[PDB]
Amino acid sequence: ASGWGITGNKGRCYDFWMDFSECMSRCREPKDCGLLREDYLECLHHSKEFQRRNRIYKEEQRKIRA
Amino acid sequence: MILSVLSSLALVSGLMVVRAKNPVHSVLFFILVFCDTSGLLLLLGLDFSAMIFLVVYIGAIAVLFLFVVMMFHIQIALWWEMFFILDNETIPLLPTQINTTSLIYTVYAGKVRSWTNLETLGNLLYTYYFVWFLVPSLILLVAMIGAIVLTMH
Amino acid sequence: MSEFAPICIYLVISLLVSLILLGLPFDIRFYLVSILFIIFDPEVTFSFPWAVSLNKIDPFGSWSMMAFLLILTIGSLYEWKRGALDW
Amino acid sequence: MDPIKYFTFSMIIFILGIRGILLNRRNILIMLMSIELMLLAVNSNFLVFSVSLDDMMGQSFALLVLTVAAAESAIGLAIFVITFRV
Amino acid sequence: SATTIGALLGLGTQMYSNALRKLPYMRHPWEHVVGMGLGAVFVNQLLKWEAQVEQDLDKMLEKAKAANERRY
Amino acid sequence: MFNLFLAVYPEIFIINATFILLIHGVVFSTSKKYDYPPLVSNVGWLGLLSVLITLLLLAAGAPLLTIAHLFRNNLFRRDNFTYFCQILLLLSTAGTISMCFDFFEQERFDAFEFIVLILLSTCSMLFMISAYDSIAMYLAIELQSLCFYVMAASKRKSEFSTEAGLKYLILGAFSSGILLFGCSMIYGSTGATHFDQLAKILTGYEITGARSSGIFMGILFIAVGSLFKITAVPFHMWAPDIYEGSPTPVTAFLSIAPKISIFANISRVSIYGSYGATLQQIFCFCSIASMILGALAAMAQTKVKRLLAYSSIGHVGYICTGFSCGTIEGIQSLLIGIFIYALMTIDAFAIVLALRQTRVKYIADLGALAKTNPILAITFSITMFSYVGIPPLAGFCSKFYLFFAALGCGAYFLAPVGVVTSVIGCFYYIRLAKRMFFDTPRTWILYEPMDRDKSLLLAMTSSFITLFFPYPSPLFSVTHQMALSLYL
Amino acid sequence: MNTDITASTKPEYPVVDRNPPFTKVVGNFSTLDYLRFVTITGVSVTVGYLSGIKPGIRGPSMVTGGLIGVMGGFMYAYQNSAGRLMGFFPNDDEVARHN
C-alpha cells in the first residue's frame, strides 16, 4: 500500500508497510524480518483477528451445550 | 438487505443480457445491470464513481449501443464454490459482530475536515500519477480517429 | 450519505403519483455524433475533479490539464477537417 | 462478510460475461456487451478493494480502465457497423 | 584491415540489392562507393562498440563480485 | 524543457511528430487547392524520418535518459535492458515502414491515418518496455492494442479484412480482460501494484498462508493473459486466420513489434513477481505444446501466409523453451533468440510482400523462381533454412545456443522435443527447397520486383544471416550486459 | 513534490552544474551543437521536399519537414548541451569556463 488513504490521511495500514520496507531494504539479511510480513498482511486482512474472535465465540457456544 | 436486492437484480439482469433474445431486450437489461451496479457502488460509500457510472457507462456508452442496435433491428440473423468460500472460518461469524458493534473507536481528529472522494481523487490524479492521466488522452484520441478512418467514407 | 434515502423515497413517490395520473382517464451521422459524445464526456468527467482541487495543486495541475485538453483538441481538429461533424 | 459478498458478485458477473463471449459466437452485439460486462466486474472489484484495504490507487485505476472500456466499446462497435454494411 | 572488410561488405550488399531487382549488377556505379563507405564505417564502429561494451560488462562483473563478496 | 523531462525526450518527440503528421495529413488531404492528394507516401516518409530521429535521440542520450530516477520511478524505470530493447523496437519499426511503402501504392488504399498509428503504437510500446507498474503496463498494452485494432480492418470493400479485424479485436480484448482481472486479484490480495513493492512483499516468503490463496490466482490470470498476447499455443485460436486475413504490412508489424515488447515485459515480471514453479510450469507446458503444434501443422499447409503464421508460433515456442529456467546463461540465450527471430521474420515478410499481388493467396506459386528470378529464390531458401535449421546460419546458431543453455541449466527434457520438431521442420523445408527444380506447374512472372527499399532491407538482413557466425562476439557481450543488469 | 534530479547512473565526468536553468543551457551551445541542429533541419527539409514532389505539394511538405526538423534538431542540441552541463558527457570547455 502507498500512503494515500481514502480520506486524505496516512492510510490505515501504512506504518506497518513502512517498517516492513525499511527493514527489508536496509538490513538485507535473508528474511530475518519476514516477521513483519505477517503483520502487514494482517493489517490488510485482519485474518488472525477474525480467526481469534471466531474461536472465542466457538468455545463460548460449545460451553452452552453443558 | 438492500445490498442483496441490488446484487440479485444485477445477477438476473446479466443473465438476461446473455440469454434473452430481441437484442434490444439485451441492451435494456444491460442498462439495468449498470444502473443497479451504480446503486451498489453508492451503497459502498463512493458517491463520485456512482454518478460517473451513471454518466459515462449508462448515459454515454449504452446510448451508443442503443443507437446502433436500433438501426439494425431487423438484423436477427456455483453453490459449491460459495460454500467453499463461506466455510473458511476466516470471515467473522455475525454473532461476533453484534457485541463488537459497540466497540469501534472514532478518532474525532482525522475528521475535523473531510475530503470527499472527488476532492482527494483530483488531488492524487492530477498532481502525481499524471502520465497515468496523459495516456488515456492518447487512447481516447485513438478511439476517435479510429472511428473516423473506419466508418467515415 | 443518508441523503440518497430521501432521494429514493422521492423516486418511489414520484412513481406512485405518475401511475395515478396515468390511470385517471380509464446513419453514420448519428454514429459519429455518439462517438464524439463518448469521447468528450470523459472530458467532463476528468474536468470535474480537476475543477474542485485547483488550490492544492500549483500551476503543475493547470498545465497537465491543459496538455490533456490540447491532445483532445488536436483530436477535435482532425475531426473537423475531416468533416465528420458536417451534417 | 460484506467484502465476500462484493467480491463474489464481481466474480459471478465476470464468469457470466466470459460464458457469454464463449457460448454465443455469432452475435457480435452480445459479444461486445459481454466484454463490457467483464470490464465492469473488474472495475467493481477494483473499487471494493480500494475501499477495503485503505488505499487510493484502486480508484485511479478504476477511472483509467473506464476510459479504456469506453474506447474499446466505441471502436469495436465501429468494426461491427462496417461489417454489417455489405 | 577492418575498413577493408567493411568496404567489401558494402560493395557486396549493394551488388545484391542491384541483383534482386533484375536490373544489372552495376546499375548506378556511383552508389557502390556509398555502399563501400557505409560498410566501412559500420564495421569500424561495430568493433569500437564491441570493445566498449566488453569494458562495461567487465566493470559490471567486477561490481557483481562485491555483491557476492559480502555473501561468502 | 524542464530538466526533468530529459528522461522522456524520445517519447515527447515521437508524440509531437505523430501530432504534426496527423494535422498535416488531414488538412492537405482535404484541401481543394491541390487536386485531392492522398498523402500516404509523404506522411510515411516523414514518419520514417521522425522514427530515425527518435532512434538517434534515445541512443545517443541513454546515460542522461536515466535522469529522473524517483520522480519517474512512480511509473517507469529505465536501465540498460530498456535501452537496448527500445533500440531494437525502433529499428524494427523503421524497417517495417520502409518495407511497406510500396505496398500502399500498389494495393492502392488511401488513408494516411495508417501511418499516424504506426508511430502512435510505437510510442505505446516504448512506454511498455520501460514500464515498472502493473497498471502502467496494462495501459500501454491497451494503447498498443487499440492502435492495432484500428490498423487491422483497413480495406472495407474487401472480404477478409472485416472478419479478420473483428476476430483480432475480440481476441485481444478478451486477453486484456483476463489480464485486468489478474492484476485486480494481485492488488486485492497483496496491497500494492509497483514492481518494487511486489518484489519486496512476495520474494522468498512465498510460503503458503491463510490468505495466500489469492495472490496465486492473480499471477495465474496474469500468466494466461500475457500468454494470449504471445499467441499462447493452447489459446492460439484464429492466429493463422488473422495472419491470413489482415494485410501484409499489418501482419508483419503485428508479428515483429509487439512480441519483443511483451517478451521484455514478461521477463521484467517473471524476474520479480513469480513463484518457485508457477510461471515456469505454466510456460514449460506451452513451450512443448508450441513446438509440437508448429511442427505438426506447418508440415501440411497450402497458403504461404498460414505457413508463416505457424512458423512464427514455432519460433515463439523455441523462445519460450529458452525461458524455462532462470539462470544468466539461459536468459542470455533467450534474448539472443528474440533478436535473431526479429531479423528472420522481417526478412521473410519482405519476401512474401515482394511476392504479393500476382499471388493473392497461393503456395504452389513457386513457379520456377529458381528460373525466373534465381537470386530471389536463393534468398528465400536462405531465409527459410535459417528459420528452421541447417549448418551455420543465424537461426541454427540461435537454437543451438538455446539448447546448450537448456542442457547446462538442469532440464534434460526440452532438448528431445526441441530437436525432433527441428528435424521434422528441416526435413519438410529441405524437401520443399529441393522441390524447386523437379518441375513447375504454374508460372507467375511478376511485375512486383522489389523497387529499392525492400531490396536494400532484404539484402542487408540476408547478408547478416549467413555472415553471423564469423563474428558473434558483440551480440553475446551486449546480451550479457543486458541480462546481467536486468536485476543485479 | 519530487522535483529533484538524481540519476540511476552517475556523472562519470565533472559536475560543473547539477540542474542548469533553461536559458543557461540554450545559451551554452557550442559550434558542434549548431552544426547538429542545422544538419537535422536540412535533411528533414530535403526529404519533405522530395516526398512532396510526389503528390504535388512541394511547398507544404517542405514546411512540415522543416517543423519536424527544427523540433528534432533543437531537442538534440539541448540534450547534448544539458549533458555537457551535468557530467554525463565530456566536459572540457565547460570546465574551462566554470573554473
Is C38 within 8 Å of B147 (Cβ atoms)?
no
Q: What are phi and psi of A4, to 5 degrees?
A: -70, 85
- Give the separation between CA F368 and CA C62, rounded to whole angstroms: 66
| Three-state SS at A14 | coil
Closest of F363, F257, F374 to residue F310, by C-alpha: F363
Minimal C-alpha gap between F143 and chain B (Å): 6
Give the DSSP letter of residue F442. -
Is F116 within 8 Å of F43 (Cβ atoms)?
yes
Q: Output the nine-digit C-alpha cell for G73.
A: 534538431
Q: Which helix (H) or strand (E) holds F431?
A: helix F414-433
Torsion of CA C12, C14, C19, C22, to 10 degrees: -170
- CB contacts of D73 in chain C (<8 Å) are 38
Beta bridge partners of F133: F194
For every residue of F167-236, DSSP letters joined together read HHHHHHHHHHHHHHHHHHHHHHHHS--BHHHHHHHSSS-----TTTHHHHHHHHHHHHHHHHTTT-GGG-
* Chain F residue with Cα closest to E56: F481
Phi-psi region of G28 (alpha: psi -120 to 50; beta: other; left: phi over 0): alpha
Chains that touch B (3 or more CB pairs under 8 A): A, C, D, F
Closest of F110, F89, F115, F98 to residue F18, by C-alpha: F115
Give the DSSP letter of residue F302. -
Which among F74, F111, F210 is the nearest to B90, CB-wise?
A: F210
Is F169 within 8 Å of F188 (Cβ atoms)?
no
Minimal C-alpha gap between C85 and chain D (Å): 16
For every residue of F317-349, DSSP letters joined together read HHHHHHTSS--HHHHHHHHHHHHHHHHHHHHHH
Residue B151 in contact with partner chain C when CB distance is under 8 A = yes
Helix and strand numbers, DSSP H then E, in chain F:
20, 0
* Chain B residue with Cα closest to D34: B18
Whether residues F139 and B136 touch (CB distance < 8 A) is answered with: yes
Residue B117 in contact with partner chain C when CB distance is under 8 A = no
Q: Output the nine-digit C-alpha cell for F362.
A: 497461393
* Chain B residue with Cα closest to A11: B110
| Three-state SS at G81 | helix
| Three-state SS at A65 | coil
Helix-strand-coil split of chain E, %, nearest 5: 80, 0, 20
Is F106 within 8 Å of F238 (Cβ atoms)?
no
Given in angstroms, what resolution was this structure solved at? 3.9
Whether residues A6 and D57 touch (CB distance < 8 A) is answered with: no
Q: Give the orientation angle of helix F9-29 with respect to helix F40-65, to 10 degrees.
A: 170
Minimal C-alpha gap between F207 and chain A (Å): 11
Q: How far apart are the first and last CA of chain B?
A: 53
- Give the separation between CA B95 and CA B100, rounded to whole angstroms: 9
Which among D45, D46, D68 is the nearest to F142, CB-wise?
A: D68
Q: Output the nine-digit C-alpha cell for D85.
A: 454494411
Minimal C-alpha gap between B38 and chain D (Å): 9
- Give the separation between CA D67 and CA B137, rounded to whole angstroms: 9
Chains that touch E (3 or more CB pairs under 8 A): F
Beta bridge partners of A10: A4
Whether residues F135 and D64 touch (CB distance < 8 A) is answered with: yes
Whether residues A34 and F201 touch (CB distance < 8 A) is answered with: no
Q: Output the nine-digit C-alpha cell for F271.
A: 524476474
- Give the separation between CA F67 and CA F81, rounded to whole angstroms: 16
Residue given cell 491470413 in the structure block: F244
Residue given cell 534538431 in the structure block: G73
Residue F459 in contact with partner chain E when CB distance is under 8 A = yes
Q: What is the CA radius of gyration of chain G?
A: 18
- Give the separation between CA F417 and CA F320, rounded to whole angstroms: 13
Whether residues E49 and F474 touch (CB distance < 8 A) is answered with: yes
- Give the separation between CA D16 and CA B17, rounded to whole angstroms: 10
From residue B79, alpha-carbon distances to B83, D65, D80 in Å are: 6, 31, 37
Residue F201 in contact with partner chain A when CB distance is under 8 A = yes
- CB contacts of E56 in chain F (<8 Å) are 481
Helix spans in D27-86 (H) = 28-52, 57-83
Distance of CA B23 to the CA centre of its chain: 22
- Give the separation between CA A39 and CA A48, rounded to whole angstroms: 10
SS3 letters across G15-35? CCCCCCCHHHHHHCCCHHHHH
- Give the separation between CA F217 and CA F220, rounded to whole angstroms: 5
CB pairs under 8 A between B and F: 47
Is F347 within 8 Å of F99 (Cβ atoms)?
no
Burial of C69 (0-12, 13-18, 19+ CB in 10 A): middle
Helix spans in chain B (H) = 2-19, 23-44, 47-52, 63-71, 79-86, 94-99, 117-127, 131-151
Is D69 within 8 Å of B53 (Cβ atoms)?
no
Beta bridge partners of F399: none
In one-letter notation, the amino acid at residue F414 is L
- Give the separation between CA C71 and CA C76, rounded to whole angstroms: 9
Is B26 within 8 Å of D33 (Cβ atoms)?
yes
From residue F91, alpha-carbon distances to E47, F8, F86 in Å are: 20, 18, 9
Distance of CA B101 to the CA centre of its chain: 29
Whether residues B125 and C38 touch (CB distance < 8 A) is answered with: no
Q: Which helix (H) or strand (E) holds A57?
A: helix A47-62
- CB contacts of B115 in chain A (<8 Å) are 7-8
C interface with F, Cβ–Cβ < 8 A, is 71, 74, 77-78, 81-83
Whether residues B151 and D82 touch (CB distance < 8 A) is answered with: yes
- CB contacts of A6 in chain B (<8 Å) are 117, 120
Minimal C-alpha gap between F189 and chain A (Å): 8
Give the DSSP letter of residue F133. B
- Give the separation between CA B49 and CA B40, rounded to whole angstroms: 11
Beta bridge partners of F194: F133
- Give the separation between CA F455 and CA F332, rounded to whole angstroms: 31
| Three-state SS at F27 | helix
**Alpha-carbon torsion F438, F439, F440, F445, what sign?**
positive
Which among D38, D65, D79 is the nearest to F153, CB-wise?
A: D79
CB pairs under 8 A between B and C: 111
Is F235 within 8 Å of F343 (Cβ atoms)?
no
- CB contacts of D57 in chain B (<8 Å) are 129
Which of D21, D75, D83 is the best residue to mutate to test the B interface, defined by the most B CB atoms within 10 Å of its own CB? D75
Q: Output the nine-digit C-alpha cell for C48.
A: 470535474
Residue given cell 514478461 in the structure block: F266
Is G72 within 8 Å of F53 (Cβ atoms)?
yes
Burial of D41 (0-12, 13-18, 19+ CB in 10 A): buried
Q: What are phi and psi of G4, to 5 degrees?
A: -110, 145
- CB atoms closer than 10 angstroms to residue B115: 18
Is F162 within 8 Å of D79 (Cβ atoms)?
yes
In one-letter notation, the amino acid at residue F442 is R
Helix-strand-coil split of chain C, %, nearest 5: 80, 0, 20
Phi-psi region of A31 (alpha: psi -120 to 50; beta: other; left: phi over 0): left
Closest of F194, F248, F235, F25 to residue F117, by C-alpha: F25
Residue given cell 477474525 in the structure block: A50
Whether residues C81 and F27 touch (CB distance < 8 A) is answered with: yes
For residue F97, give every residue at least 6 positions away whose Cβ sits within 8 Å of its Cβ, in sequence order, or none: F44, F47, F48, F51, F115, F118
Chains that touch C (3 or more CB pairs under 8 A): B, D, F
For residue F188, give every residue at least 6 positions away whose Cβ sits within 8 Å of its Cβ, in sequence order, or none: D7, D45, D48, D49, D52, D53, F214, F218
* Chain B residue with Cα closest to A53: B96
Q: Output the nine-digit C-alpha cell for E50.
A: 564491441
- CB atoms closer than 10 angstroms to residue F8: 21
Closest of F309, F341, F306 to residue F322, by C-alpha: F341
Q: Output the nine-digit C-alpha cell for G97.
A: 569556463
Buried b (16+ CB within 10 A) or exposed e, F316-331: bbbbbbbbbbeebbbb
Q: Output the nine-digit C-alpha cell for F98.
A: 520502409
- CB atoms closer than 10 angstroms to residue F24: 25
From residue G27, alpha-carbon distances to B104, F457, G82, G85 in Å are: 64, 41, 11, 12
Torsion of CA E57, E62, E64, E68, to 10 degrees: 150
From residue F262, alpha-carbon distances to D86, F127, F216, F399, F476 in Å are: 36, 11, 21, 21, 22
Burial of B122 (0-12, 13-18, 19+ CB in 10 A): buried
Q: What are phi and psi of F202, to 5 degrees?
A: -135, 40
From residue B59, alpha-carbon distances to B25, B35, B43, C41, D70 in Å are: 17, 10, 20, 9, 12
Residue given cell 505457424 in the structure block: F310
Q: Output the nine-digit C-alpha cell for B128.
A: 502525481
Q: What are phi and psi of F133, to 5 degrees?
A: -165, 140
For residue F481, give every residue at least 6 positions away whose Cβ sits within 8 Å of its Cβ, in sequence order, or none: E53, E56, E57, E60, F80
- CB contacts of B18 in chain D (<8 Å) are 16-17, 19-20, 23-24, 30, 34
Q: Give the orientation angle of helix F114-129 with respect to helix F80-107, to 10 degrees.
A: 170
